[PDB]
Design an enzyme around this catalytic site. Structure first.
Site, PDB file in Angstrom:
ATOM      1  N   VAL A 304     -27.898 -29.873 -19.176  1.00 36.68           N
ATOM      2  CA  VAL A 304     -29.156 -30.351 -18.658  1.00 36.68           C
ATOM      3  C   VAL A 304     -28.875 -31.293 -17.467  1.00 36.68           C
ATOM      4  O   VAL A 304     -29.647 -31.276 -16.585  1.00 36.68           O
ATOM      5  CB  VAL A 304     -29.931 -31.201 -19.978  1.00 36.68           C
ATOM      6  CG1 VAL A 304     -31.013 -32.031 -19.568  1.00 36.68           C
ATOM      7  CG2 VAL A 304     -30.208 -30.530 -21.067  1.00 36.68           C
ATOM      8  N   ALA A 305     -27.871 -32.046 -17.258  1.00 39.58           N
ATOM      9  CA  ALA A 305     -27.482 -32.698 -16.220  1.00 39.58           C
ATOM     10  C   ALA A 305     -27.667 -31.838 -14.867  1.00 39.58           C
ATOM     11  O   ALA A 305     -27.605 -32.398 -14.027  1.00 39.58           O
ATOM     12  CB  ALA A 305     -26.350 -33.726 -16.383  1.00 39.58           C
ATOM     13  N   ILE A 307     -28.572 -28.689 -14.218  1.00 37.54           N
ATOM     14  CA  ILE A 307     -29.927 -27.945 -13.648  1.00 37.54           C
ATOM     15  C   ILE A 307     -30.878 -28.813 -13.160  1.00 37.54           C
ATOM     16  O   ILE A 307     -31.234 -29.784 -13.772  1.00 37.54           O
ATOM     17  CB  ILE A 307     -30.401 -27.254 -14.819  1.00 37.54           C
ATOM     18  CG1 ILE A 307     -29.241 -26.501 -15.862  1.00 37.54           C
ATOM     19  CG2 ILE A 307     -31.342 -25.863 -14.323  1.00 37.54           C
ATOM     20  CD1 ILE A 307     -28.398 -25.640 -15.221  1.00 37.54           C
ATOM     21  N   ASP A 351     -49.783  -5.316  17.568  1.00 38.77           N
ATOM     22  CA  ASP A 351     -50.762  -4.641  18.068  1.00 38.77           C
ATOM     23  C   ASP A 351     -51.469  -5.538  19.066  1.00 38.77           C
ATOM     24  O   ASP A 351     -51.652  -6.757  19.165  1.00 38.77           O
ATOM     25  CB  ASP A 351     -51.777  -4.007  17.193  1.00 38.77           C
ATOM     26  CG  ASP A 351     -50.992  -3.191  16.069  1.00 38.77           C
ATOM     27  OD1 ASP A 351     -50.486  -2.187  16.275  1.00 38.77           O
ATOM     28  OD2 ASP A 351     -51.131  -3.580  14.933  1.00 38.77           O
ATOM     29  N   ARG A 560     -58.073  -0.399  32.678  1.00 37.11           N
ATOM     30  CA  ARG A 560     -58.129   1.056  32.102  1.00 37.11           C
ATOM     31  C   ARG A 560     -58.977   1.576  33.314  1.00 37.11           C
ATOM     32  O   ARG A 560     -60.334   1.396  33.135  1.00 37.11           O
ATOM     33  CB  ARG A 560     -58.612   1.010  30.671  1.00 37.11           C
ATOM     34  CG  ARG A 560     -58.492   2.468  30.069  1.00 37.11           C
ATOM     35  CD  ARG A 560     -58.665   2.672  28.703  1.00 37.11           C
ATOM     36  NE  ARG A 560     -57.811   1.736  27.835  1.00 37.11           N
ATOM     37  CZ  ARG A 560     -57.997   1.513  26.755  1.00 37.11           C
ATOM     38  NH1 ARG A 560     -59.021   1.859  25.789  1.00 37.11           N
ATOM     39  NH2 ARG A 560     -57.134   0.985  25.624  1.00 37.11           N
ATOM     40  N   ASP A 703     -53.323  -2.724  10.238  1.00 41.78           N
ATOM     41  CA  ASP A 703     -54.705  -2.864   9.588  1.00 41.78           C
ATOM     42  C   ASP A 703     -54.961  -1.831   8.853  1.00 41.78           C
ATOM     43  O   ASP A 703     -55.916  -1.851   8.172  1.00 41.78           O
ATOM     44  CB  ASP A 703     -55.407  -2.965  10.959  1.00 41.78           C
ATOM     45  CG  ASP A 703     -55.838  -1.855  11.987  1.00 41.78           C
ATOM     46  OD1 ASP A 703     -54.533  -1.272  12.008  1.00 41.78           O
ATOM     47  OD2 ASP A 703     -56.657  -1.563  12.402  1.00 41.78           O
ATOM     48  N   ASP A 707     -50.542   1.831   8.548  1.00 40.14           N
ATOM     49  CA  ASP A 707     -49.401   0.632   8.506  1.00 40.14           C
ATOM     50  C   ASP A 707     -48.789   0.129   7.533  1.00 40.14           C
ATOM     51  O   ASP A 707     -47.906  -0.611   7.642  1.00 40.14           O
ATOM     52  CB  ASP A 707     -50.484  -0.427   9.190  1.00 40.14           C
ATOM     53  CG  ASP A 707     -50.984   0.133  10.617  1.00 40.14           C
ATOM     54  OD1 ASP A 707     -50.003   0.339  11.629  1.00 40.14           O
ATOM     55  OD2 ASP A 707     -52.080  -0.245  10.958  1.00 40.14           O
ATOM     56  N   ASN A 796     -35.573 -35.542 -14.269  1.00 43.93           N
ATOM     57  CA  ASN A 796     -35.553 -34.422 -13.416  1.00 43.93           C
ATOM     58  C   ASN A 796     -37.245 -33.855 -13.217  1.00 43.93           C
ATOM     59  O   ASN A 796     -37.337 -33.398 -12.242  1.00 43.93           O
ATOM     60  CB  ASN A 796     -34.585 -33.285 -13.884  1.00 43.93           C
ATOM     61  CG  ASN A 796     -33.232 -33.857 -13.741  1.00 43.93           C
ATOM     62  OD1 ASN A 796     -32.833 -34.864 -13.337  1.00 43.93           O
ATOM     63  ND2 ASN A 796     -32.378 -33.480 -14.437  1.00 43.93           N
ATOM     64  N   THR A 799     -39.941 -38.265 -13.313  1.00 42.45           N
ATOM     65  CA  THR A 799     -39.461 -39.512 -12.194  1.00 42.45           C
ATOM     66  C   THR A 799     -38.801 -38.973 -10.885  1.00 42.45           C
ATOM     67  O   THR A 799     -39.469 -39.743  -9.942  1.00 42.45           O
ATOM     68  CB  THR A 799     -38.269 -40.287 -12.917  1.00 42.45           C
ATOM     69  OG1 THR A 799     -38.706 -40.639 -14.125  1.00 42.45           O
ATOM     70  CG2 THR A 799     -37.687 -41.663 -12.316  1.00 42.45           C
TER      71      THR A 799
HETATM   72  N1  LIG Z   1     -51.204   9.370  22.179  1.00 45.12           N
HETATM   73  C1  LIG Z   1     -52.243   9.127  23.271  1.00 45.12           C
HETATM   74  N2  LIG Z   1     -52.154  10.352  24.218  1.00 45.12           N
HETATM   75  C2  LIG Z   1     -53.089  10.304  25.192  1.00 45.12           C
HETATM   76  N3  LIG Z   1     -54.179   9.227  25.216  1.00 45.12           N
HETATM   77  C3  LIG Z   1     -54.267   8.237  24.233  1.00 45.12           C
HETATM   78  C4  LIG Z   1     -53.252   8.236  23.291  1.00 45.12           C
HETATM   79  N4  LIG Z   1     -53.423   7.063  22.634  1.00 45.12           N
HETATM   80  C5  LIG Z   1     -54.581   6.607  22.900  1.00 45.12           C
HETATM   81  N5  LIG Z   1     -55.038   7.278  24.129  1.00 45.12           N
HETATM   82  C6  LIG Z   1     -56.279   6.883  24.906  1.00 45.12           C
HETATM   83  O1  LIG Z   1     -56.324   5.480  25.125  1.00 45.12           O
HETATM   84  C7  LIG Z   1     -57.344   4.853  24.669  1.00 45.12           C
HETATM   85  C8  LIG Z   1     -57.176   3.443  23.879  1.00 45.12           C
HETATM   86  O2  LIG Z   1     -56.287   3.765  22.591  1.00 45.12           O
HETATM   87  P1  LIG Z   1     -56.478   3.340  21.305  1.00 45.12           P
HETATM   88  O3  LIG Z   1     -55.606   3.904  20.311  1.00 45.12           O
HETATM   89  O4  LIG Z   1     -57.988   3.650  20.615  1.00 45.12           O
HETATM   90  O5  LIG Z   1     -56.664   1.685  21.331  1.00 45.12           O
HETATM   91  P2  LIG Z   1     -55.492   0.968  20.398  1.00 45.12           P
HETATM   92  O6  LIG Z   1     -54.159   1.256  20.638  1.00 45.12           O
HETATM   93  O7  LIG Z   1     -55.705  -0.554  20.931  1.00 45.12           O
HETATM   94  O8  LIG Z   1     -55.930   0.961  18.731  1.00 45.12           O
HETATM   95  P3  LIG Z   1     -55.741  -0.240  17.644  1.00 45.12           P
HETATM   96  O9  LIG Z   1     -56.696  -1.101  17.734  1.00 45.12           O
HETATM   97  O10 LIG Z   1     -54.296  -0.722  17.793  1.00 45.12           O
HETATM   98  O11 LIG Z   1     -55.636   0.523  16.466  1.00 45.12           O
HETATM   99  C9  LIG Z   1     -58.183   5.708  23.914  1.00 45.12           C
HETATM  100  O12 LIG Z   1     -59.284   5.571  24.860  1.00 45.12           O
HETATM  101  C10 LIG Z   1     -59.716   6.971  25.119  1.00 45.12           C
HETATM  102  O13 LIG Z   1     -58.372   7.959  24.845  1.00 45.12           O
HETATM  103  C11 LIG Z   1     -57.657   7.056  24.024  1.00 45.12           C
HETATM  104  C12 LIG Z   1     -60.653   7.628  24.129  1.00 45.12           C
HETATM  105  N6  LIG Z   1     -60.853   7.731  22.745  1.00 45.12           N
HETATM  106  O14 LIG Z   1     -59.767   7.615  21.983  1.00 45.12           O
HETATM  107  O15 LIG Z   1     -61.574   8.465  22.254  1.00 45.12           O
HETATM  108  C13 LIG Z   1     -61.759   8.293  24.864  1.00 45.12           C
HETATM  109  C14 LIG Z   1     -61.914   8.304  26.397  1.00 45.12           C
HETATM  110  N7  LIG Z   1     -63.356   8.693  26.853  1.00 45.12           N
HETATM  111  O16 LIG Z   1     -63.341   9.689  27.458  1.00 45.12           O
HETATM  112  O17 LIG Z   1     -63.955   8.088  27.036  1.00 45.12           O
HETATM  113  C15 LIG Z   1     -61.089   7.675  27.005  1.00 45.12           C
HETATM  114  C16 LIG Z   1     -59.803   7.229  26.482  1.00 45.12           C
HETATM  115  N8  LIG Z   1     -58.806   6.612  27.507  1.00 45.12           N
HETATM  116  O18 LIG Z   1     -59.153   6.936  28.638  1.00 45.12           O
HETATM  117  O19 LIG Z   1     -58.035   6.389  27.510  1.00 45.12           O
END
Ligand SMILES: Nc1ncnc2c1ncn2[C@@H]1O[C@H](COP(=O)(O)OP(=O)(O)OP(=O)(O)O)[C@H]2OC3(O[C@H]21)C([N+](=O)[O-])=CC(=[N+]([O-])O)C=C3[N+](=O)[O-]
Ligand SMILES: C/C=C(/C)C(=O)O[C@H]1C(C)=C2[C@H]([C@@H]1OC(=O)CCCCCCC)[C@@](C)(OC(C)=O)C[C@H](OC(=O)CCC)[C@@]1(O)[C@H]2OC(=O)[C@@]1(C)O
Ligand code: NA
Length: 994
Positions: A304-305, A307, A351, A560, A703, A707, A796, A799
């Site tokens: 007892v002492a 643990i 992400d 972009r 998310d 994942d 233990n 106190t």
């Molecule tokens: N593996 C890949 N190979 C080639 N391209 C990739 C790839 N992964 C993503 N992209 C292009 O990049 C943009 C961003 O990717 P997306 O995965 O949607 O964002 P996240 O990475 O932040 O996702 P998350 O929020 O982390 O879940 C998307 O926008 C678009 O096509 C996609 C998109 N779309 O997904 O639908 C439509 C668009 N138009 O035409 O409007 C233009 C994009 N763009 O320019 O990049």
């Protein structure tokens, strides 16, 4: 058929030997059910209540205490006296603690949810098949569906298995598969084979995945895989195969338990060896029965002492409190033991979108071609104000506002932006802010044309919800959208086919409006628009365009870029195959360049500071993003992950680049990498493995269901508040606000909690060291028991439990986030500190034993036997020192035990003050730095007086109230423990430099 996506519909039907119009026969169903089993994830571990109760008695220390209880019960059953009401107290107390400990453990399992069981959310009760034994569709239980089944799905349906689409019965088929692919908008499906055998799920345009929803349409398909073989089933198997290590504290606690039982037994052997002179005692005469009781009696007290019985409760109380504190800072901790691991984080993999950035995409730059004249070229370059999806803002050139409609090139720019678009804009009346409807990229274009207002429509007349789509609506009435060629990752573009709304049965007039990544779009442009005119695309023009794109996308702007183009003379409407997405690039050729738009998804206002804190704390941060590599790197530079000018070639990788590296190079990449662009769900898991082979403690964000494997494997899985329930149940922590800064603030809080935990663990354990010495001393010197188990348990549990808990509220060091991550293998007590607690332990043992012995001898109230020894005898069948009259039950008086207990209790109040700081003097860090601690000590003392005065308790604990004189002796022997530790603290500071 795992490779279904790459097989033709004919080939899928022939593999299973099934007809599309009839479906499987009864014999086929039976044979396919035997071969592939039922369409379901395997049942949860059959963990019964009885098995659970037993598991609560598995810990080494709880076994010791059960054995202690059993011996204690036997010694109560065969004792000398008539009081049964007081004899069975000791065993009953120990048993109650074991039962209470068991109740809590059992309770924790009933309220626990596991992620594998949260997957079953995504398997519907029913599905729809055609089988040969019936003409019409038959709705059956999803579990009775087998590979080969002809399946029917329709709007609103949850997909029952992984299905190869055979034919789409409506214009289009739309699918919400966000849970698996993170695709925002519902995706379009086709029936043509997808050639790549290793196509990622996003490219499997002819597949329906188990657990996703039909957003629009009606489709017939053939079941490719079921059960554990589906995409969701494979995720399940990965999770089931992930074993999670114990946290560093749990590992040290277990190490402690192993060592403690080893030491307990060795003390028992010593106590036996120190009493081998009993072999020289005559066999006739003497009490064997009483001498054997005496040995077992101290074995129980010893157990007892040793643990720290109240330690698990202190840890839990501390964890619960800090957890509610972390919740107010948006960090929702699901696993109490993970707060420690969180403090040890050495790598955060995060992400980008929504976590590092706001996910509020806004166009702030665009350009069109101004002039083309041979080798000479010029652009009309504009900027746009406003960081919200709100139409609030204006177009500027050279910082001065211009009318957008004044440039014909911009009119078409807006037209392309408005029409080549699957997203809209809406004002949330409840939230009070504008919210996107669809893809962020596209909604930013929607917002742009509202700001542009190319035909000068009256927008001030309408309200928030009404003007949200005002300028867009004007453009929609100008062209009729015949169809849309959806975005594809291979060609990296999308287009719409449009016919004039003004014309009827015309031959010419139709346009394709095209949008996408600049590279592929620009290469497929043969023409350049200059106002309303058109010139051929030439080298000098192409250079100029790409030059600006490169600057916008890779420079400090970190934008972009999207290229906008038109096919002036699109293929005849009837000559287009809309079901074969592999022909879509061909349809988007011979284009005319119109312009480029550049959009920013801005960093969270707090992330840049939080990345700095990570650098100061020696925590590496890895960005994971869907941006192309050049833009990814630019963003890392912008937010502080990379330096503005530092070289990063071997510190940033795309999925492609990373896969082309052999295993050894992949591991090495992970130790230096800080940026991963365009990876697949599988990469997150591989990154964690590689980090774990360098013994990193990894935090990883996620998310979606995809994942879950990585979240489960990382030491700290971190889920988004806005993400799926599955991701949350696979995580240690949930970000209520989704903010990266919440992670960092949780790491700091975790560092501070652990530091205080270390103090109270050292405080509680050091007291046990002292209690053991007391028991060993009394057994070694043949003295009467100075302390009994019931008293030791009170100290233990209650106190010391309060000052222990109070130490949990010690202020944190100001340099907390200025030191490297704590080493997992760092011992709680070692080196000089080990010597310190030996010295305090040796003091406490002697101070308690001495206090009891003092009462027996040199005290006023006591039977003054000065230099007479209790060591001599506890026999009472010789009467050597006492020469007249019979009295021996004073050897079992409550007063000397009360002296011993009050000494322990007092020293421990002093030692809690000693525990405020490891090395700092009470002269430099005073006791009043922790008001809670001062409060707890007062409460503990009043509770000590409670068991001294309140009728029932004094008898139970075998105590009686001390005199004023006797209390002064308590203070005389107790208080100098402060002096002792103060001296030992002085030596550590001055004579042990780092
Ligand atoms: N593996 C890949 N190979 C080639 N391209 C990739 C790839 N992964 C993503 N992209 C292009 O990049 C943009 C961003 O990717 P997306 O995965 O949607 O964002 P996240 O990475 O932040 O996702 P998350 O929020 O982390 O879940 C998307 O926008 C678009 O096509 C996609 C998109 N779309 O997904 O639908 C439509 C668009 N138009 O035409 O409007 C233009 C994009 N763009 O320019 O990049
Ligand atoms: C606590 C009670 C007892 C009886 C036991 O001796 O504790 C040992 C013990 C199990 C350890 C030791 C104790 O060793 C001694 O007390 C010195 C030996 C003299 C025995 C006295 C005989 C009369 C701790 C307590 O020594 C001191 C002086 O503090 C420190 C530490 O414990 C910790 O670091 C905290 C673990 C959460 C552990 O050496 C630990 O074992 C290892 O796993 C550690 C690494 O854990
Ligand atoms: Na985890």
């Amino acid at each position: 058929m795992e490779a279904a996506h790459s097989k033709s519909t004919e080939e899928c039907l022939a593999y299973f030997g099934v007809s599309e119009t009839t479906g499987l026969t009864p014999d086929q169903v039976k044979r396919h059910l035997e071969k592939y089993g039922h369409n379901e994830l395997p049942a949860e571990e059959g963990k019964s209540l009885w098995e659970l109760v037993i598991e609560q008695f598995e810990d080494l220390l709880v076994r010791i205490l059960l054995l202690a209880a059993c011996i204690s019960f036997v010694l109560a059953w065969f004792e000398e006296g008539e009081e049964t009401i007081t004899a069975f107290v000791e065993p009953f107390v120990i048993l109650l603690i074991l039962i209470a400990n068991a109740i809590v453990g059992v309770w924790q399992e009933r309220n626990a949810e596991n992620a594998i069981e949260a997957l079953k959310e995504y398997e519907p009760e029913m599905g729809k098949v055609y089988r040969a034994d019936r003409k019409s569709v038959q709705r059956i239980k999803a579990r009775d569906i087998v590979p080969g089944d002809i399946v029917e799905v329709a709007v609103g349906d949850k997909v029952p298995a992984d299905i190869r689409i055979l034919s789409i019965k409506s214009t289009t088929l739309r699918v919400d598969q966000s849970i698996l692919t993170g695709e925002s908008v519902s995706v379009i499906k086709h029936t043509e084979p997808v050639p790549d055998p290793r196509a990622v799920n996003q490219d499997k345009k002819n597949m329906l995945f188990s657990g996703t929803n039909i957003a629009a349409g009606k489709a017939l398909g053939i079941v490719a895989t079921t059960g554990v073989s589906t995409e969701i089933g494979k995720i399940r198997d990965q999770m089931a195969a992930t074993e999670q290590d114990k946290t560093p504290l749990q590992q040290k606690l277990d190490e402690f338990g192993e060592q403690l039982s080893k030491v307990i037994s060795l003390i028992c052997v010593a106590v036996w060896l120190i009493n081998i002179g009993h072999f020289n005692d005559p066999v006739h005469g003497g009490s064997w029965i009483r001498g054997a009781i005496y040995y077992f009696k101290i074995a129980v007290a010893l157990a007892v002492a040793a643990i720290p019985e109240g330690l698990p409760a202190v840890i839990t109380t501390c964890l619960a409190l800090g957890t509610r504190r972390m919740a107010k800072k948006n960090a929702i901790v699901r696993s109490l033991p993970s707060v420690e691991t969180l403090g040890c984080t050495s790598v955060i993999c995060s992400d980008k979108t929504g976590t590092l950035t706001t996910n509020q995409m806004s166009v702030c730059k665009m350009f069109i071609i101004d002039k083309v004249d041979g080798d000479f070229c010029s652009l009309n370059e504009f900027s746009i104000t406003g960081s919200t999806y709100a139409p609030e803002g204006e177009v500027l050139k050279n910082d001065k506002p211009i009318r957008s409609g004044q440039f014909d090139g911009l009119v078409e720019l807006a037209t392309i932006c408005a029409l080549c678009n699957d997203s809209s804009l809406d004002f949330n009346e409840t939230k009070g802010v504008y919210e996107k409807v669809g893809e962020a990229t596209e909604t930013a274009l929607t917002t742009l044309v509202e700001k542009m207002n190319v035909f000068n429509t009256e927008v001030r007349n309408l309200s928030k919800v009404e003007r949200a789509n005002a300028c867009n609506s004007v453009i929609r009435q100008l062209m009729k959208k015949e169809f849309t060629l959806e975005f594809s990752r291979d060609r990296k573009s999308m287009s719409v086919y449009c016919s004039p709304a003004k014309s009827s049965r015309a031959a010419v007039g139709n346009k394709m409006f095209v949008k996408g990544a600049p590279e592929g779009v620009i290469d497929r442009c043969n023409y350049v628009r200059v106002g309303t005119t058109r010139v051929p695309m030439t080298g000098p023009v192409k250079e100029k365009i790409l030059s600006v794109i490169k600057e916008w996308g890779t420079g400090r702007d970190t934008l972009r870029c999207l290229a906008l183009a038109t096919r002036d003379t699109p293929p005849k409407r009837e000559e287009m195959v809309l079901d074969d997405s592999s022909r879509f690039m061909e349809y988007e050729t011979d284009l005319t360049f119109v312009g480029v738009v550049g959009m920013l998804d801005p960093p969270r206002k707090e992330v840049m500071g939080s990345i700095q804190l990570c650098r100061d704390a020696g925590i590496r941060v890895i960005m994971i993003t869907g941006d192309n590599k050049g833009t990814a790197i630019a963003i890392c530079r912008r937010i502080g992950i990379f330096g503005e000018n530092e070289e990063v070639a071997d510190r940033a990788y795309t999925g492609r680049e990373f896969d082309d590296l052999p295993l050894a190079e992949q591991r090495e990449a992970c130790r230096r990498a800080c940026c991963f662009a365009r990876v697949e769900p599988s990469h997150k898991s591989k990154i964690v493995e590689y980090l774990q082979s360098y013994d990193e403690i990894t935090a990883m964000t996620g998310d979606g269901v995809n994942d879950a494997p990585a979240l489960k494997k990382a030491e700290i899985g971190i889920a988004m508040g806005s993400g799926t329930a599955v991701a949350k149940t696979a995580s240690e922590m949930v970000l209520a606000d989704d903010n990266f800064s919440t992670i960092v603030a949780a790491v700091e809080e975790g560092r501070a909690i652990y530091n205080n935990m270390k103090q109270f663990i050292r405080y509680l354990i050091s007291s046990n060291v002292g209690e053991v010495v007391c028991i060993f001393l009394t057994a070694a010197l043949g003295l009467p028991e100075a302390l009994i188990p019931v008293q030791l348990l009170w100290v233990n549990l209650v106190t010391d439990g309060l000052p222990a808990t109070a130490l949990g509220f010690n202020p944190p060091d100001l340099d907390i986030m200025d030191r490297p991550p704590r080493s997992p293998k760092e011992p709680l007590i070692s080196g000089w500190l080990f010597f310190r607690y030996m010295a305090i332990g040796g003091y406490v043992g002697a101070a308690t034993v001495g206090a009891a012995a003092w009462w027996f001898m040199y005290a006023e109230d006591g039977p003054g036997v000065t230099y007479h020894q209790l060591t001599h005898f506890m026999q009472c069948t010789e009467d050597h020192p006492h020469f007249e009259g019979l009295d021996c039950e004073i050897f079992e008086a409550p007063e000397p035990m009360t002296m011993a207990l009050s000494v322990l209790v007092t020293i421990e109040m002093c030692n809690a003050l000693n525990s405020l700081s490891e090395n700092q003097s009470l002269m430099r860090m005073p006791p009043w730095v922790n008001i809670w601690l001062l409060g707890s000590i007062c409460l503990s003392m009043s509770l000590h007086f409670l068991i001294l005065y309140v009728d029932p308790l004094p008898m139970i604990f075998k105590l009686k109230a001390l005199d004023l004189t006797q209390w002064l002796m308590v203070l005389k022997i107790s208080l100098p423990v402060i002096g002792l530790d103060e001296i030992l603290k002085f030596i550590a500071r001055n004579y042990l430099e780092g």
